[PDB]
Design a protein around this ligand. Structure first.
Ligand SMILES: [Yb+3]
Ligand SMILES: [Yb+3]
Ligand SMILES: [Yb+3]
Ligand SMILES: [Yb+3]
Ligand SMILES: [Yb+3]
Ligand SMILES: [Yb+3]
Ligand SMILES: [Yb+3]
Ligand SMILES: [Yb+3]
Ligand SMILES: [Yb+3]
Ligand SMILES: [Yb+3]
Ligand SMILES: [Yb+3]
Ligand SMILES: [Yb+3]
Ligand SMILES: [Yb+3]
Ligand SMILES: [Yb+3]
Ligand SMILES: [Yb+3]
Ligand SMILES: [Yb+3]
Ligand SMILES: [Yb+3]
Ligand SMILES: [Yb+3]
Lengths: 364, 364
């Protein structure tokens, strides 16, 4: 009796160990449980001293048989867990690989965005300048019209005043854009503010209207010249656009496709996380979709960016990874399922044995 | 003696339970261990029957004292774990909240990208058409020059042939762009391919050169008209650009800032994951950086997009989340540290007691 106590108590050493080898699956966990077992089939052997029923009746046969059976499966249950962890380690490693690639992809998208903007800006500038001169043309014209339309010097001076700020504004806006071949035009735009200003401050007098009329006429001349200069810039803008437009269109198409790809790469990282954190076939197939999505994006890019080195390298890095992961994911789903079922039955075995051995003690 | 066996064996029931309440921290785990304890201080009480040394000498005092002490801490160690899990649940919940917002942010960035392109395309089209007419102008001119420069009908026909494909190409390219006010111009561009073609096929004859000379002259006229039309389109392009350029610049600035923000939102999701998966103060402070980065991005956007509803709502949703999480993260670091230390000492207590109680058995 004090020996059945010994067995039941020694068995509890096994129960614990096994639970640890299953809750956890440390290597020491295993050894611990394997030692607990050998010493238990020792203790359970000394109990074998007592005999009652022999072949006709022997429950403890069941336990010693069990204990022997379970001990055989320990190492295989460890390689199962040890193998599942290796697949999960690799999945994490490959997601780091993909993240690294997505980074280069993003750097490239940025490069491409910059390159578009730079090219799109050549004509933008040309057209900004075209408008400057056309605003100057339009201004000088408004001045000549409204001043020369004023009858008295009082109102001619009034009108000039209203427009006097714009005269310097216009000069600063167009100074650098001024055709260097022209020289009187230069004189007009720069001298204008001082002259007209002075006339405004100076009290109505002899020749104040002469001077006004002179600049009303220098402005009309300038207006037509600046209009021509503007159309000069416009013609430029159209040549330079037309000659970059292909390049730009082509890059916006690549850059769009790059952003698309980078997005699907992030969709992988998300789906993979769900997979790793709930490793069913369900999550596997969701992750598989995200994979095919990246595969599309890459073939799409492959057409517009065939020969674009970065894309060649990106596909060279990406696709072998995805291929490995598609298979690795299947493997992991499987090993994970085996691990859980075997770890289930294993625990079941450690409960049939307790049930059985509680038995003998019930029998006393 | 058979009672010390009872205690040591009953204690092993406790050892296991406790380990489960610590490896795991299920509610049933707790109850299990709390039941294992009450019955152990029962069994350890019957052993109290034996007395040896009394106050002068009593190790089992140590165990029964222990067992009493540990039992008191169980529930507090559970609320510690129960509280740590609540913080981790909320962290995950708030990351879902942020992800949801990042989505709206991305939809908006897309909206804005579309809106730029649409606006940037008004002038692009105008300039594409401007170049079409200027290519047509240039073509008709090349034809008049090279044909009319040819002396004999043989080479006049030769030259026309070379240029004959372009005549229809040009017609299709510019047809819709043709100023409807003009009517002879219409006649020339459309009639051209047929007439010139016919002249080419028809064998050199009387009036073949007359007909050529007629179209050489209709082409020069058309050339100057198309050049004017082109400059018409150009002028349009410059007005329409200049009148959208502010809108476009402003949107590219918002869209850039939106993409920037969305990026920092992803940086949070990453840092948070590292935090959750290694919940040290170190990872907390890294996540804190990602938070401040988002906070910047939002104030930046707040200036360019002040009044942009979507941004008002985004900041209204984002910032309270980040605030909660900054504090929640501190809390979690703390509770997590307490949990681990207390769960450590708890296990230590279940080892001093085994050491002590192994003792009495050593004493026998
Ligand atoms: Yb060892
Ligand atoms: Yb050790
Ligand atoms: Yb753009
Ligand atoms: Yb005016
Ligand atoms: Yb005006
Ligand atoms: Yb006016
Ligand atoms: Yb007016
Ligand atoms: Yb690999
Ligand atoms: Yb059985
Ligand atoms: Yb129960
Ligand atoms: Yb139950
Ligand atoms: Yb663009
Ligand atoms: Yb030519
Ligand atoms: Yb040519
Ligand atoms: Yb030529
Ligand atoms: Yb030539
Ligand atoms: Yb909350
Ligand atoms: Yb002690």
């Amino acid at each position: 009796s004090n020996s059945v106590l010994k067995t039941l108590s020694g068995f509890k050493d096994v129960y614990a160990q096994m639970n640890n080898f299953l809750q956890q699956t440390t290597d020491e966990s295993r050894r611990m449980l394997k030692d607990a077992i050998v010493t238990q089939k020792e203790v359970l052997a000394e109990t074998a001293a007592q005999v009652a029923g022999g072949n006709g009746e022997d429950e403890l046969a069941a336990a010693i048989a069990a204990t022997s059976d379970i001990e055989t499966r320990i190492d295989g249950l460890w390689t199962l867990h040890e193998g599942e962890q290796k697949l999960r380690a690799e999945t994490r490693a490959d997601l780091e690989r993909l993240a690294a690639e997505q980074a280069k992809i993003n750097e490239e998208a940025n490069r491409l965005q910059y390159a578009v903007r730079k090219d799109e800006n050549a004509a933008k500038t040309m057209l900004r300048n075209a408008e400057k001169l056309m605003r100057a043309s339009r201004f000088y014209a408004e001045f000549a019209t409204e001043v020369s339309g004023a009858i008295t010097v009082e109102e001619k001076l009034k009108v000039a005043e209203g427009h006097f700020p714009a005269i310097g504004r216009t000069q600063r806006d167009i100074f650098v854009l001024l055709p260097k071949g022209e020289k009187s035009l230069a004189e007009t735009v720069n001298s204008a503010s001082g002259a007209i200003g002075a006339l405004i401050k100076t009290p109505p007098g002899p020749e104040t209207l002469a001077g006004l009329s002179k600049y009303v006429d220098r402005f009309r001349t300038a207006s037509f010249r600046l209009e021509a200069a503007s159309v000069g810039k416009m013609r430029e803008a159209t040549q330079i656009f037309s000659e970059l437009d292909g390049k730009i269109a082509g890059t916006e198409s690549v850059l769009t496709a790059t952003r698309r790809l980078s997005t699907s790469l992030t969709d992988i990282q998300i789906a993979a996380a769900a997979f790793l954190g709930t490793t069913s076939e369900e999550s596997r197939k969701k992750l598989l979709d995200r994979f095919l999505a990246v595969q599309s994006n890459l073939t799409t890019l492959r057409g517009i960016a065939s020969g674009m080195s970065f894309f060649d390298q990106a596909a060279g890095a990406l696709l072998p990874i995805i291929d490995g992961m598609k298979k690795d994911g299947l493997a992991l789903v499987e090993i994970t399922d085996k691990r859980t079922v075997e770890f289930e039955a294993a625990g079941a075995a450690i409960n049939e044995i307790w049930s059985d051995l509680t038995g003998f003690a019930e029998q006393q």
